[PDB]
Design a protein around this nucleic acid. Structure first.
Ligand SMILES: [Mg+2]
Lengths: 587, 102, 621
RNA sequence: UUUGCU
RNA sequence: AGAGAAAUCAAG
């Protein structure tokens, strides 16, 4: 580790890039996820009261509590209603133009949203076929079920789809005829299918010792989630305290550039949030949204539309999974919770078939932007006279006070406000440097006026697998995006180009002695393109140009070969030219 | 869409990777190499595009320029650009109103 | 009641006497949008003369007598209600400017005039891109952007949207039963209205304690960790064979070979060697695939899961208990330092042969020069050879995992020197795999040529003695089960070259910027915290050691390493801050060293990094 | 299923 | 036997 600590030429901050082993395989979760899911579901209830009383907390519907019950020493699971209201009001007042842009989006853009984009989601669990399916298939079958049970035609707009869902929720019995079976749902069964969340291992997650799961909602409630998340994105992109989803370059550099009169105490606090998703209450988020919309003069139906998904999540049913593992000396058996004593027996009362019903806490990957907004509203107070940037979990705060006592008071106030809204900053992962100038945030390491952007995942410098021209264009585009983003300078950019070029040439049998090279040698077919074996034509300053045009401008391609390979009548067939090499693979 | 990324090496090395519409221009067997498969869109080996670049029906030069015009513009712009030393470290309304008055 | 800054004074004053805005709902907004329409017409009409006369004639806010006179001059007639805003003489067509929230909602309407439809964001209807020029569209877009900025800055979005589009309608509603279902797990209604006075209380917090000294990581006790990577590292060797194809080299190896077991491992019995030679022979005679043999049963765990099932069932007399797992703690083994020393040993050939890019600009030349110098620095090292070996082995083994197969497949590890001589690092035999998922662990029998054997380092390997042309070699056999994803990741293990390249380039460019001249042939002294005799090293040696350590980390990447590095970045930053005479302050009950120590269990590379951290000073003055 | 990335 | 880490593969 001392090898990564240079103290002569560069700083340890510069070598922060050496503390990533992403060039190796990412850990993959193994076996049943029931233990992790149950731990995530139970964490909120233990933290609700200062002394863990899970049985008492399991009866609490809304996770609101008084400031006395807020734990200033360990994680807290609830929120303060009055504090949330006042903080939301302050946030609305301070960023009024952002709220006006949100109003413009609601009045103009929201009604014209199409639910076709709803087919871009993750693997959805079909409440008809009872298994995970690709998003387009689940959307298709759900829409067909809606048409069958409503005797009407769902409009192309997302609002129409949500209204259709709300209407079909009014039928005591619903039927789906599909080839040929007739699935019948009662109102309670369809409600359970709508509110049930499906948990899945978050495969290929780095920087974590323990694997954690994520949740996906049913296709029935995905429209409301999309509406709410789009509104959250619209409000966030116009707020200077947000680090997502837009580029963090400007966000982090803007605060790094700021200075003072060399007389005020300046501090930089970098931190993360402990159990971020296992402490937030959907009720707090929907209350914040209601405050925003009401102070914005929005109509009642908009407020109902925004609130519905949060209530549905509040009445969720988390899928337990395969079950907890029990041994019999040397055997192994996965059994559902409640069959035998375990660590989560307190939750046995909440078991509903193979699903566990929980009210507090959240699951990762569902309401990211709303969670970020909730974190942001809590920073708008009179005491907190300092800059703040937050990305879901990570956060960086800049304090500019008159004395160290004021700075520490402001830091503690920030911690306590985050507790107030239901977010606990991990004390072990929060570090404050004074004077300011050194910090870390969203894998960007800032030192004085140099912000080193370190990629969280090194680019997979290999062809995408579509076809030679498309693959080359996409790979060069990826390298250029990584370079101009600051994650790779000129030398490492050229090195990445060389590595990708070697991999790309190998993938198409153009490097050594293969069938392709043998054929081109026997028939004296000179290699004129990179995928054929020709020396690379792109460079550091020419990753945005097409191979064919660039070669033609350089004379490396002649009119005869150009007319031969670009002929549209060739029986073979992103800004790559449609040449004869733009073929398609069989399977 | 990581599956195509991992499958490329095996996909290309398969016996009949390329899937192409049947055609008579491509010879069935050229100099000992069986380029096409007679069973249906048919299949062909990766050497077919290389073969086309040497023995293929040429389209008109005008077609070539039209297809390449968009990208050739960017190439010309870059090579015509000049790179400096590298460092280390109201009237419209008036006309309308006057015209209306006229 | 004032004039918006983006509307000219003359237009405002003119519109003041055109309509009874006071008696119109949202009169100010109506007047403002009408002024926008007039200004759009003016932008269209500016500096456009047809045959010496204006190309566009504006009928907006002009007397009906004059408008009708102009229309008669053009032999056209329009009603009072459907009076077009503009008339293009060149095109001899009447137009009626329109503003709409969304362009798609617009319709052609009647045929008396083509509708120039635009949205508040400055975009125009697809038809407008034809009639109007590029400059006209750009000017209108800029003006409407300014107008939208004024709208948002004055909280008039709803009024404008109502004025141009119409009135919003009830686009959503929920029945009583759905409301009943929703109000099942919450104290509030669909629209939460908790009647409580908004106010943020003042909670009693804690004090932020200063971190005066850096923490010490916990070094675990226990058996030294053995080599657990897929292939070998510094102990990798190869047999030199005459130039030729893989089959020819394997036939040459098989012809002159006396494989005899030197050290049998009870985890990989020596008998399994028969499964290797049989494949080696099979690959020699053309086909790499091969039918199973008796020994294969114990080589790839054939019909083993059922065996354990039956064995456990026969002796399971008891009661069920919660499955508790325990990771066996292990200490730092002494072979990590030896591996690091050996990995940076100089070689003869350069093992990083990557083609150069096409230098066009001076920047391209500088980048290629930096990359070439880096390749020269790290090219002739054993770590590069091991990286090439790992890449070739992973690629050859992963290329055979895309189909279900019940027969043994042989995937040799052969690399060719620039003189063409083959180099046999070893072989990988793929047992019968029937992959139905991706991450399923395929069974492998990995034979590798090893330079030196240590029982404490390779407890599960079986070491045999190979003899070729008199020369003696050691051959280690390991029965492994490896995931497809890891094999694919290692198929491009060449990416390990980027991080040390980044550090080297950063150092060189920092020197160049300090001197304003790029001197590529430079290697300064990087002062570090070393054993004590030496206080630093040149840039090239430092880069080589960084490459070796990064390769080891990549080969030993796993959840422990991930967590250790993720939680060690914080302590690295804290040390850097302490170096610059800054103060590090922590919240109540904070111990980052706990988050780091959580991830020090088995990994030998993590233990090496932790020991290196402990060696450094923890107090700065 | 035939095998050549320093 | 083995890979591995909180529990899966070692066929179905
Ligand atoms: Mg952070």
């Amino acid at each position: 580790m001392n090898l990564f600590t240079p103290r002569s030429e560069i700083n340890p901050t510069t070598t922060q890039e050496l503390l990533y082993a992403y060039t190796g395989p990412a850990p993959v979760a193994y076996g049943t996820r029931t233990r992790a899911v149950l731990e995530n579901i139970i964490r909120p209830y233990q933290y609700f009261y200062k002394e863990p009383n899970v049985q008492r907390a399991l009866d609490i519907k809304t996770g609101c509590k008084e400031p006395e019950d807020i734990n200033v020493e360990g994680p807290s699971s609830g929120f303060h209603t009055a504090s949330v209201l006042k903080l939301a009001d302050n946030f609305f007042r301070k960023y009024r133009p952002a709220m006006e842009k949100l109003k413009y989006w609601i009045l103009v853009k929201l009604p014209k949203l199409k639910y076709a984009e709803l087919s871009k989601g993750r693997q959805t669990y079909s409440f008809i076929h009872k298994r995970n399916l690709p998003a387009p298939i689940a959307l298709e079958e759900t829409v067909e079920f809606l048409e069958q049970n409503l005797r009407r035609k769902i409009g192309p707009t997302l609002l129409s789809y949500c209204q259709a869902i709300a209407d079909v929720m009014e039928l005591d019995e619903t039927t789906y005829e599909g080839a040929t079976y007739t699935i019948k749902f009662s109102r309670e069964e369809l409600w359970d299918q709508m509110r049930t969340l499906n948990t899945m291992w978050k495969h290929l997650e780095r920087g974590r010792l323990n694997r954690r799961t994520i949740a996906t909602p049913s296709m029935l409630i995905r429209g409301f989630v999309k509406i709410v998340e789009d509104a959250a994105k619209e409000i966030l992109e116009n707020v200077p305290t947000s680090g997502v989803p837009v580029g963090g370059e400007e966000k982090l550099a803007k605060l790094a550039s700021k200075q003072t009169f060399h007389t005020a105490v300046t501090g930089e606090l970098s931190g993360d949030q402990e159990k971020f998703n296992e402490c937030l209450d959907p009720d707090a988020m929907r209350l914040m949204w209601t405050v925003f919309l009401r102070k914005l003069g929005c109509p009642d139906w908009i407020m109902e539309l925004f609130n519905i998904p949060f209530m549905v999540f509040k009445s969720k049913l988390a899928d337990m999974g395969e079950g907890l593992v029990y041994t019999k000396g040397k055997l192994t058996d996965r059994k559902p919770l409640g069959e035998m004593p375990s660590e989560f027996d307190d939750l046995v009362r909440n078991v509903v078939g193979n699903s566990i019903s929980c009210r507090l806490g959240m699951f990762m990957g569902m309401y990211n932007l709303t969670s970020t907004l909730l974190a942001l509203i809590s920073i708008e107070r009179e005491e907190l006279t300092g800059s703040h940037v937050e990305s879901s979990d990570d956060f960086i705060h800049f304090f500019n006070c008159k004395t160290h006592e004021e700075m520490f008071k402001q830091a503690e106030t920030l911690r306590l406000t985050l507790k107030l809204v239901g977010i606990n900053m991990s004390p072990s992962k929060c570090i404050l440097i004074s004077p300011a100038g050194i910090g870390e945030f969203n894998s960007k390491f800032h030192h004085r006026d140099f912000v080193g952007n370190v990629a969280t995942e090194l680019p997979a410098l290999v062809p995408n697998g579509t076809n030679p021209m498309t693959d080359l264009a996409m790979g060069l585009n990826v390298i250029k995006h990584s370079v101009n983003t600051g994650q790779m300078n000129l030398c490492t950019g050229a090195l990445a180009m060389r590595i990708f070029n070697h991999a790309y040439k190998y993938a198409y049998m153009a490097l050594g002695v293969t069938r392709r090279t043998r054929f081109m040698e026997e028939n004296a077919i000179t290699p004129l393109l990179t995928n054929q074996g020709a020396s690379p034509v792109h460079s550091f300053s020419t990753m945005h140009l097409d191979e064919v045009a660039l070669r033609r401008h350089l004379g490396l391609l002649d009119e005869e070969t150009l007319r031969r390979i670009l002929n549209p009548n060739n029986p073979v067939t992103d800004y790559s030219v449609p040449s004869c090499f733009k073929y398609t693979l069989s399977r | 869409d990581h599956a195509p990324q991992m499958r490329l090496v095996y996909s290309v090395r398969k016996p009949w990777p390329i899937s192409m519409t049947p055609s008579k221009e491509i010879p069935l067997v050229f100099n000992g190499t069986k380029l096409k498969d007679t069973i249906l869109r048919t299949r062909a080996n990766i050497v077919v595009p290389d073969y086309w670049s040497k023995y293929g029906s040429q389209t008109s030069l005008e077609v070539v320029n039209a297809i390449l015009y968009a990208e050739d513009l960017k190439v010309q712009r870059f090579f015509s650009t000049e790179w400096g030393e590298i460092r280390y470290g109201t009237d419209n309304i008036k006309a309308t109103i006057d015209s209306q008055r006229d | 009641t004032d004039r918006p800054d983006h509307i000219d004074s003359r237009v405002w004053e003119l519109s003041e006497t055109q309509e009874d805005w006071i008696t119109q709902v949202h009169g100010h907004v109506r007047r403002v949008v009408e002024c926008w329409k007039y200004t759009i017409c003016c932008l269209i009409s500016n500096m456009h003369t047809h045959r010496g006369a204006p190309q566009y004639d504006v009928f907006k806010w002009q007397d009906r007598s004059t408008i009708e006179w102009i229309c008669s001059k053009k032999k056209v007639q329009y009603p009072e209600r459907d009076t077009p805003d503009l008339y293009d003489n060149e095109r001899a067509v009447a137009y009626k400017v329109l503003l709409v929230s969304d362009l798609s909602d617009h319709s052609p309407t009647s045929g008396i005039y083509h509708d120039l439809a635009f949205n508040l964001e400055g975009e125009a209807e697809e038809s407008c891109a034809l009639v109007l020029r590029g400059s006209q569209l750009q000017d209108i877009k800029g003006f409407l952007c300014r107008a939208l900025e004024w709208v948002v800055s004055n909280n008039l979005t709803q009024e404008v949207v109502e004025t141009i589009s119409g009135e919003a309608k009830l686009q959503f509603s929920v029945g009583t039963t759905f409301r009943t279902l929703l109000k099942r797990d919450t104290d509030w209604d669909v629209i939460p209205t908790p009647r409580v006075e908004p106010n943020v209380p003042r909670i009693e917090g804690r004090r932020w304690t200063q971190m005066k000294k850096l923490p010490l990581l916990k070094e675990k006790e226990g058996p030294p960790s053995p080599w657990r990577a897929l292939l070998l590292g510094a102990d990798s060797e190869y047999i030199v064979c005459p130039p030729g194809t893989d089959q020819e080299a394997i036939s040459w190896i098989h012809s002159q070979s006396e494989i005899e077991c030197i050290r049998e491992s009870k985890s990989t019995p020596a008998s399994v060697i028969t499964c290797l030679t049989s494949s080696l022979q099979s690959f020699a005679e053309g086909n790499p695939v091969r039918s199973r043999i008796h020994e294969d049963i114990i080589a790839f765990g054939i019909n083993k899961k059922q065996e354990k099932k039956q064995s456990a069932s026969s002796s399971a007399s008891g009661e069920w208990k919660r499955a508790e797992y325990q990771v066996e703690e292990m200490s730092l083994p002494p072979w990590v330092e030896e591996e690091m020393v050996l990995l940076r040993s100089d070689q003869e050939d350069n093992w990083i042969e990557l083609e150069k890019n096409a230098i066009y600009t001076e920047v391209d030349g500088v980048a290629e020069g930096l990359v070439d110098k880096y390749i020269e620095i790290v090219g002739r090292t054993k770590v590069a050879s091991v990286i090439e070996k790992w890449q070739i082995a992973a690629t050859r083994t992963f290329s055979q995992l895309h189909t279900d197969r019940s027969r043994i497949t042989a995937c040799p590890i052969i690399t060719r020197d620039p003189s063409g001589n083959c180099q046999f690092w070893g072989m990988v035999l793929l047992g019968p795999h029937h992959v139905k998922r991706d991450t399923d662990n395929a069974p492998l029998l990995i034979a590798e040529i090893m330079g030196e054997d240590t029982e404490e380092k390779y407890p599960k390997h079986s070491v045999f003695s190979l003899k070729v042309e008199g020369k003696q070699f050691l051959l280690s056999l390991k029965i492994t089960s490896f995931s497809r994803n890891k094999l694919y990741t290692f198929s491009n293990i060449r990416r390990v070259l980027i991080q040390p390249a980044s550090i080297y380039s950063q150092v060189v460019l920092s020197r160049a910027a300090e001197n304003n001249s790029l001197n590529l042939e430079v290697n300064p002294e990087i002062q570090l915290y070393l054993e004590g005799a030496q206080r630093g090293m040149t840039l090239y040696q430092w880069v080589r050691m960084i490459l070796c350590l990064e390769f080891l980390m990549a080969i030993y990447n796993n959840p422990q390493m991930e967590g250790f590095l993720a939680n060690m970045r914080r302590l690295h930053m804290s040390r850097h801050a302490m170096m610059e005479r800054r103060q590090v302050f922590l919240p109540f009950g904070s111990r980052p060293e706990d988050k780091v120590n959580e991830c020090i269990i088995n990994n030998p590379i993590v233990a090496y990094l932790a020991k290196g951290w402990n060696s450094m000073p923890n107090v700065y003055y």
